């Protein structure tokens, strides 16, 4: 049985090349500042009924892509301890869409890390329920982010995990 990977790339994630995308999505679905722009962009027709609790992820097939809207929570807007639960659901929810569906690989954004982040740097705490969560599925992870000191961070976590 194969192990599942992880790898980090700054870059913009609507340029991946694995079987699948995760958007950074809001449970209404809309396009708005943040990962979604760029997903959207590329894959216009993706947004369809992506409508979908927070916590909870939601998957389609379209313009020839999986994308899987999976709903952080917005630490605006929750108690620490509430958010940090919802964000290890909206994880779970992810790995299990990758597993149920035999997707193999699948490019990620640190969920809750921008628009939902409620002004604090939440990168290590994504990026662990991230691993707790995928660490179920058998899929090589490529994760994405902008930020050089973000890029740096995420690779020295996956690389204590060897
Ligand atoms: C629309 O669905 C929109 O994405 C949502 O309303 C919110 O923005 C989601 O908020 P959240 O904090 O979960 O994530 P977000 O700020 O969108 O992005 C997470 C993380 O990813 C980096 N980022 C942003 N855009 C990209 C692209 N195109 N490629 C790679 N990485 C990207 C941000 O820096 C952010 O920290």
């Keep these: ?37 760029a997903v959207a962009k590329k894959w216009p027709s993706s947004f369809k009924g992506a409508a979908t609790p927070v916590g909870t992820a939601k998957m389609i097939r379209a313009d020839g892509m999986t994308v899987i809207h999976a709903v952080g929570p917005n630490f605006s807007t929750v108690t620490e301890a509430e958010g940090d639960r919802e964000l290890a659901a909206a994880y779970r929810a992810v790995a299990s869409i990758i597993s149920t569906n035999n997707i193999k690989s699948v490019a990620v954004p640190l969920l809750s890390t921008g628009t939902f982040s409620g002004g604090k740097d939440r990168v290590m705490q994504s990026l662990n329920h991230l691993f707790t969560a995928l660490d179920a599925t058998d899929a090589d992870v490529v994760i994405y ?18």
């Design 1 to 37: 049985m194969k192990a599942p990977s992880y790898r980090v790339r700054r870059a913009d994630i609507s340029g991946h090349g694995e079987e699948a995308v995760v958007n950074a999505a809001n449970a209404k679905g809309t396009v708005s500042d943040g990962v979604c722009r």
């Design 145 to 162: 982010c902008r930020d050089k000191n973000w890029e740096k961070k995420i690779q020295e976590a996956i690389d204590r995990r060897t």
